[PDB]
Amino acid sequence: DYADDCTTPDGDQGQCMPFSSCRTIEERLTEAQKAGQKVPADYASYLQKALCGEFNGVRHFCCPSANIQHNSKVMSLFKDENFDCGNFLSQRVSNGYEVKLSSRPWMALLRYQQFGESRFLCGGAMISERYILTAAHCVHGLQNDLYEIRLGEHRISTEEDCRQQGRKKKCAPPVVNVGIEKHLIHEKYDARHIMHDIALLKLNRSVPFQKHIKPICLPITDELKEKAEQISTYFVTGWGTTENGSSSDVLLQANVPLQPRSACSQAYRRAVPLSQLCVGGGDLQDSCKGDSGGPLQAPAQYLGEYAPKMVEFGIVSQGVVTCGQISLPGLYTNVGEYVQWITDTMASNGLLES
């Protein structure tokens, strides 16, 4: 299967990866192409021996562990100088939870058609013109119910979301309501224990970036993956969307602390692996601001960009409850541990049409 442990024909331990996620294979293939030639016969023979299957129409090869890289077919987008992810200024500091109109333009609302009606029951965040990142618990066993995504939202109840501009008002453009072509749940998602709680939703058309709809950045470098545990305070943003729908009509945000994993391991009476982050708890109105499957976000140095960019470091997995009651620390998916899976899943499923 994709990413299974394997041994290369030359005896190195590795994982079953697409060629675009193996620095050494990609270099050999690129070097031959650049010279206007095929790879030598002995190397073609090595690749046949290294072949570990075909998953979602992509040939996979055993790649030595140290040579595994994020999928170059997707990294070319994320590293593009014109890929405008995590852009924010954004607002002047108020004590409460208010969010400036359009200031978190990646925020997504997941719509479900159930008891004859439809409701937003999860959140998520735009990561590209065709992909939304969310929790697997928002998607698993719900493929027939989960049917639309809403992007560019601020206040759910009003079709027009405006702010004062002088003696007049400036409104954000209309929201975008888009369908879902693919429900892409992590292969190792455990629905019983809630582990590897991550999923991608591929939109059924491209949603071009607009002033109020833009992607969030991902922790695509070693520095950013390492940063997840060094950040003291994160933004927990959303409409407080749970199985009971949104608790807030308007987008809100709180500054919530990263906690030691022991806080969650004690509260949930279960081991907390490195693939999870422990956040917040012990408050009445802060930890609860997030959406089920929504982002855990913070500004960071993204590649060589001058301005800090917002990066999604976590995904709301468990323990984020309704406001007004004392919360327990919340479990979040540690996004850095899944960027490899994200890039390979987006690559095999296509950035544009499938």
Ligand X SMILES: *[C@@H]1O[C@H](CO[C@@H]2O[C@@H](C)[C@@H](O)[C@@H](O)[C@@H]2O)[C@@H](O[C@@H]2O[C@H](CO)[C@@H](O[C@@H]3O[C@H](CO)[C@@H](O)[C@H](O)[C@@H]3O)[C@H](O)[C@H]2NC(C)=O)[C@H](O)[C@H]1NC(C)=O
Ligand Y SMILES: *[C@@H]1O[C@H](CO)[C@@H](O)[C@H](O)[C@H]1NC(C)=O
Chain residues 156-185 in contact with Ca ion, contact rule CB under 5 A: 158, 161
Q: Pick the catalytic residue: 60, 70, 137, 196?
A: 137
| Residue 321: CB minimum distance to ligand Y, A | 4
Is residue 119 close enough to count as binding ligand X by CB under 6 A? no
Sign of the Cα torsion 30, 35, 39, 42 reads negative
In the three-class reduction of DSSP (H, G, I as helix; E, B as strand; rest coil), residue 231 is classed as coil
Q: What dihedral angle (degrees, nearest 10) is formed by the CA atoms of 305, 152, 181, 56?
A: 20
Q: Point out the residue whose Cβ comes nearest to Ca ion.
A: 161
Is residue 114 close enough to count as binding ligand X by CB under 6 A? no
Tokens of 133: 């990142």
Answer yes or no: 94 catalytic: no
Q: Pick the catalytic residue: 292, 317, 327, 348?
A: 292
Q: Which is nearer to ligand Y, 253 or 292 (CB)?
A: 292
Instruction: Give the residues across from 16 on adjacent strands.
Output: 62
Q: Is 101 exposed, middle or buried (0-12, 13-18, 19+ CB in 10 A)?
A: middle
Q: Is the peptide bond before 90 cis (omega within 30 degrees of 0)?
A: yes
Q: Which is nearer to ligand Y, 307 or 326 (CB)?
A: 326
Binding-site annotation: residue ranges for Ca(2+) = 153, 155, 158, 161
What backbone torsions phi and psi does residue 236 show, to the nearest 5 degrees? -110, 110
Answer yes or no: 292 catalytic: yes
Residues that bind ligand Y (CB under 6 A): 242-244, 321-322
Q: Pick the catalytic residue: 186, 196, 197, 344?
A: 197
- Report the relative pairing of strands 168-171 and 131-134 from DSSP bridges: unpaired
Q: Which amino acid is at 201?
A: L
Residue from the set 23, 119, 155, 225 that interacts with Ca ion by CB under 5 A: 155
List, by residue number, the catalytic residues: 137, 197, 292
Q: Which residues bind ligand X (CB under 6 A)?
A: 147-148, 177, 179-181, 204-205
Query: Site residues (CB under 5 A) for Ca ion?
Result: 155, 158, 161
